[PDB]
Ligand SMILES: O=S1(=O)NCN(C2CC2)c2cc(CCc3ccc4c(c3)N(C3CC3)CNS4(=O)=O)ccc21
Ligand SMILES: N[C@@H](CCC(=O)O)C(=O)O
Ligand SMILES: N[C@@H](CCC(=O)O)C(=O)O
Ligand SMILES: [Cl-]
Ligand SMILES: [Cl-]
Ligand SMILES: [Cl-]
């Protein structure tokens with residue numbers, strides 16, 4: 001019954017968790033900065049526990065293997081007892097809800113389209129009705145699962161192309177997808193979550209943009225293992241910080257307050 | 265055995281059908297939350313009976329009595345097994361009842377008569393010609409009372425003591441007040457209901473500015489209820505299948521008079 005340090009699994013994803021400039025001479029949680037770094041501190045204060053930030057070893061959000069049927073990423077860390085809690089841009093999904101707990105959402109997002117400025121694309125329907133511009137998603141994430149399991153005509157049509165496109169249209173990190181859009185002269189569009197799309201749109205060289213409306217509506221939740229006694233208090237902490245307006249303050253802090261692409 | 269569902273008459277969520285007087289049971293009602301209750305019950309495999317909350321209130325706790333009214337009280341005191349309604353997820357409610365993951369997004373918004381010289385909550389707080397208020401016994405009123413944000417705290421100080429009362433008992437009452445006040449009244453309501461009214465005749469109201477907060481509606485059950493697990497998974501399933509977006513388009517825009 002003695003108080004133990006809470007093991008927090010997170011992921012290096014800008015601006016949620018980022019290496020500080022002088023990280024090579026810093027230790028522990030001091031190495032990291034970002035939205036989820038500030039959020040982890042706010043949560044820990046309200047719940048009154050100590051915690052250690054740990055980057056997920058495999059750098060994945062969470063997917064279940066078809067053959068082995070074992071969870072990887074931050075989800076696996078919680079399922080197999082490697083971490084006590086996940087504080088990261090982890091999307092709430094049906095399949096994950098069955099195996100882990102999710103607090104009420106702390107941030108909203110929907111799948112969106114990233115294009116290099118000037119690309120003749122305005123919607124997912126435009127992508128599905130053409131072949132000149134390739135497009136893909138992140139691996140081991142909820143966006144890829146959205147298209148694989150979608151029974152909607154446009155989305156089902158897009159998945160049928162992406163799953164067998166050559167060379168692979170999928171990426172293993174968001175930065176990989178951003179670079180692919182930037183160095184493809186408009187011949188590649190990246191399907192990612194609106195939160196990350198809006199952030200990149202505010203970073204140099206300011207050559208990308210979110211186009212069209214979102215394909216779905218969901219949020220990020222603070223995840224814990226099923227039955228964890230921490231879930232109750234953290235859930236109330238999220239709602240408290242939301243009502244106080246802190247969650248709105250943190251987004252502006254890490255998305256627009258230091259936007260490198262103008263004042264607007 | 266039959267699940268008692270408490271809901272509230274709020275368009276387009278729950279509405280009396282035409283010729284409802286010769287109908288009985290769940291067939292008397294139509295709307296977004298009526299379809300949602302059917303979708304949820306089908307996925308969880310239970311029978312249910314729709315009942316309008318007796319006091320016609322969403323849910324607030326009396327300061328002295330500490331007694332919950334509205335649909336929240338129905339769940340706390342065992343009068344209903346589940347609430348399927350535009351019930352806002354809030355911190356104070358989370359302490360006393362369970363909430364599924366949200367099934368619809370909303371934020372506090374401003375309703376004005378078209379042409380009113382107002383663009384933000386900050387504009388309202390910095391003037392006195394145009395009155396403004398909220399619904400009683402709801403989450404919007406509680407948001408302003410408990411807010412330490414400068415603009416919202418300033419707005420609450422005015423509304424709590426304005427005469428005549430700027431608060432209303434129903435959404436329809438607030439809509440009417442905006443329409444026949446020649447722009448000297450703005451109504452603070454949730455964006456979902458603001459967007460619906462904006463698409464209804466006489467098309468003389470509009471939603472202005474961004475929302476003041478960001479939250480959602482959740483399917484509510486008593487704390488510890490065994491139903492909470494199945495309904496929560498049902499909501500997420502309907503979300504990923506896209507049926508929640510379908511129902512939204514069905515009851516908000518598919519019949520637009522503006
Ligand atoms: O994956 S979901 O759970 N399932 C389905 N949907 C869709 C609507 C059908 C959504 C939608 C959202 C965004 C709207 C929303 C709802 C509730 C709350 C929000 C923001 N906040 C704000 C900080 C962001 C705080 N607490 S809160 O009051 O709970 C998030 C998660 C999901
Ligand atoms: N937030 C996603 C990862 C990013 C994406 O899939 O676009 C997840 O939890 O899997
Ligand atoms: N959805 C709101 C309605 C009343 C309000 O606008 O605050 C509630 O549950 O209280
Ligand atoms: Cl320890
Ligand atoms: Cl009605
Ligand atoms: Cl009638």
Ligand SMILES: [Cl-]
Nearest residue numbers: 288289290291
């Ligand atoms: Cl019936």
Ligand SMILES: [Cl-]
Nearest residue numbers: 310311312313
């Ligand atoms: Cl039934």
Ligand SMILES: [Cl-]
Nearest residue numbers: 239243354355
């Ligand atoms: Cl709240």
Ligand SMILES: [Cl-]
Nearest residue numbers: 412413414415
């Ligand atoms: Cl302030």
